[PDB]
Design a protein around this motif. Structure first.
Motif, short mmCIF file in Angstrom:
data_model
loop_
_atom_site.label_atom_id
_atom_site.label_comp_id
_atom_site.label_asym_id
_atom_site.label_seq_id
_atom_site.Cartn_x
_atom_site.Cartn_y
_atom_site.Cartn_z
N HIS A 36 55.19 65.28 10.14
CA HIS A 36 54.28 65.97 9.24
C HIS A 36 52.86 65.99 9.81
CE1 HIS A 36 54.99 67.24 4.87
NE2 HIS A 36 53.90 67.87 5.27
N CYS A 37 52.43 64.85 10.34
CA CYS A 37 51.09 64.73 10.92
C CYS A 37 50.97 65.59 12.18
CB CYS A 37 50.78 63.27 11.25
SG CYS A 37 49.06 62.81 10.98
N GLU A 40 50.63 69.40 11.41
CA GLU A 40 49.29 69.81 11.00
C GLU A 40 48.54 70.46 12.16
OE1 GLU A 40 46.12 68.51 8.71
OE2 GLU A 40 47.27 69.94 7.51
#
Length: 136
Positions: A36-37, A40
């Motif tokens: 998820h990070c 980004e």
């Protein structure tokens, strides 16, 4: 005009992303949260460093705890279209040129790299070319 260490600005923020990302994952234990990070940001020309740092991270560590974490971490990112085939190969090659003392001094990391590499060979993320490049 006091001080004067370099005529550039601090742009090493992206470097902290991985440093904190890897550590965070190793703490929590969720590959979904980690990716998820990485999602980004859209910098595929930097992620290549993540793999290397991840491999060396456990390579120096002491325990399968991180071994399975890193291996399973990059493995998922590879099939998740997050780590192209050129990225992994480029990240692994660094290991063959970034093990000055990691191998000689303190004999133990090598035994890890071998298992980490051979393990990926079965996963289907690395070809015989890369696996063959690694010392057995």
């Amino acid at each position: 005009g006091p001080l004067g260490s370099g005529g550039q600005q601090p742009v090493n923020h992206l470097v902290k992303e991985i440093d904190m990302l890897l550590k965070e994952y190793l703490l929590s234990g969720d590959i979904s949260e980690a990716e998820h990070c990485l999602k980004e940001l859209e910098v595929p020309h930097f992620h290549h460093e993540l793999v290397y740092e991840a491999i060396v991270m456990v390579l120096e560590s002491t325990g399968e705890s991180a071994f399975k974490m890193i291996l399973d971490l990059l493995k998922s990112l590879w099939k998740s279209s997050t780590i192209t085939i050129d990225q992994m190969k480029r990240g692994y090659e660094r290991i063959y040129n970034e093990i000055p003392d990691i191998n000689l001094d303190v004999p133990h990391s090598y035994s890890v790299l071998e298992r980490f590499v051979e393990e990926c060979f079965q996963a289907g993320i690395i070809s015989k070319q890369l696996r063959d490049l690694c010392p057995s």
